[PDB]
A and B are shown apart, each in its own frame.
Chain A
Amino acid sequence: RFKKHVVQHEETMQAIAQRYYGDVSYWIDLVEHNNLKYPYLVETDEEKMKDPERLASTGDTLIIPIESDLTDVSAKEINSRDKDVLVELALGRDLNITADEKYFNEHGTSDNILAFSTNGNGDLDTVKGIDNMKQQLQARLLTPRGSLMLHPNYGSDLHNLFGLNIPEQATLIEMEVLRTLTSDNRVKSANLIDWKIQGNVYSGQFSVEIKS
């Protein structure tokens, strides 16, 4: 895992390692992760134009490992070249099945609702990054608790919670949604920020803390 950062005006590479990891001494290993040539951070972009991929300048992103992966040579090699592909790999890659986004939001808690799609040309669509995490939360919420053919106790009792719209039913629904969202270890916490009623319609929203 890693933290994101950006190059500030005339910040030296010594200064970053000292602020995040404490000891300045660690900058030496920290430059290999960002694959930098000797002018590790340089102010001017027309100087980055010298050989763009092997440098960082003012306004560019940087990668900051956690201290345990700082010394790992494999983490060094991977972070050297992958660069922005970090987030995608770290959140993982999967087949996209939100083909009919307008449609699956008309019949949730019913089956047969999702389907493969095609993007690009001649290849099934795929999803990655934060979109993948959303899609997976979405599918997990719209699936009943014991309906996947292996590893059951997956999904929700959202199909079971339909009731007289009195507030206790609404707190129950809130708690089920929060449990469902907090099931995945990748997510830190969820919390409600609004619940709202319109006769026979529930509405509400939840904030979820995704790890960096």
Chain B
Amino acid sequence: NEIQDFPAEDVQVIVEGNEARISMTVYPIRSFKKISVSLVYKQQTLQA
């Protein structure tokens, strides 16, 4: 669980003699930074 997700299709690699070049993609774990609330007060009945 050190990474949230990764696209297995997106791994590209090229090799040329002694040299290789790599590219890939990772979905990092997303945060949850903001929370908004809409708090309302209403009348109520209680009865015998």
Residue of B nearest to A201 (CB): B43
* B44 close to A (CB within 8 Å): yes
* Listed residue (B45, B47, B48) with the most chain A CB atoms within 10 angstroms of its CB: B48
Question: Could you tell me the distance in whole angstroms from the C-beta of A92 to the nearest C-beta in chain B?
Answer: 34
* A195 close to B (CB within 8 Å): yes
Instruction: Indicate if the CB atoms of A198 and B45 lie closer than 8 Å.
Output: yes
Proximity bits, B29-48, A CB within 8 Å = 1, else 0: 00000000000000111111
Residue of B nearest to A200 (CB): B43
Across the A-B interface, how many residue pairs have beta carbons closer than 8 Å? 21
Instruction: Indicate if the CB atoms of A198 and B43 lie closer than 8 Å.
Output: yes
Partner of B48, one of A196, A198, A199: A196
Q: Determine the interface band of chain A, counting residues with CB < 8 A from chain B.
A: 10 to 19
Q: How far is the CA of A197 from the CA of B46 in the complex (A)?
A: 5
Q: Determine the interface band of chain B, counting residues with CB < 8 A from chain A.
A: under 10
Question: Could you tell me the distance in whole angstroms from the C-beta of B45 to the nearest C-beta in chain A?
Answer: 6
Instruction: Indicate if the CB atoms of B43 and A199 lie closer than 8 Å.
Output: yes
Question: Could you tell me the distance in whole angstroms from the C-beta of A193 to the nearest C-beta in chain B?
Answer: 8
Residues on A with C-beta less than 8 A from B47 are 194-197
Q: How far is the CA of A195 from the CA of B48 in the complex (A)?
A: 5
Residues on A with C-beta less than 8 A from B48 are 192-196, 204
Question: Could you tell me the distance in whole angstroms from the C-beta of B27 to the nearest C-beta in chain A?
Answer: 50
Residue of B nearest to A194 (CB): B48
* A52 close to B (CB within 8 Å): no
Q: How far is the CA of A192 from the CA of B46 in the complex (A)?
A: 15
Residues on A with C-beta less than 8 A from B44 are 197, 199
Q: How far is the CA of A38 from the CA of B44 in the complex (A)?
A: 67
Question: Could you tell me the distance in whole angstroms from the C-beta of A136 to the nearest C-beta in chain B?
Answer: 26
Q: How far is the CA of A192 from the CA of B47 in the complex (A)?
A: 12
Proximity bits, A71-87, B CB within 8 Å = 1, else 0: 00000000000000000
The 6 residue pairs across chains A and B that have the minimum distance between CB atoms: A197-B46, A195-B48, A199-B43, A196-B47, A194-B48, A197-B45
In addition to A197-B45, A197-B47, A198-B45, 4 A-B residue pairs with Cβ atoms within 8 Å of each other are A193-B48, A195-B47, A196-B48, A204-B48
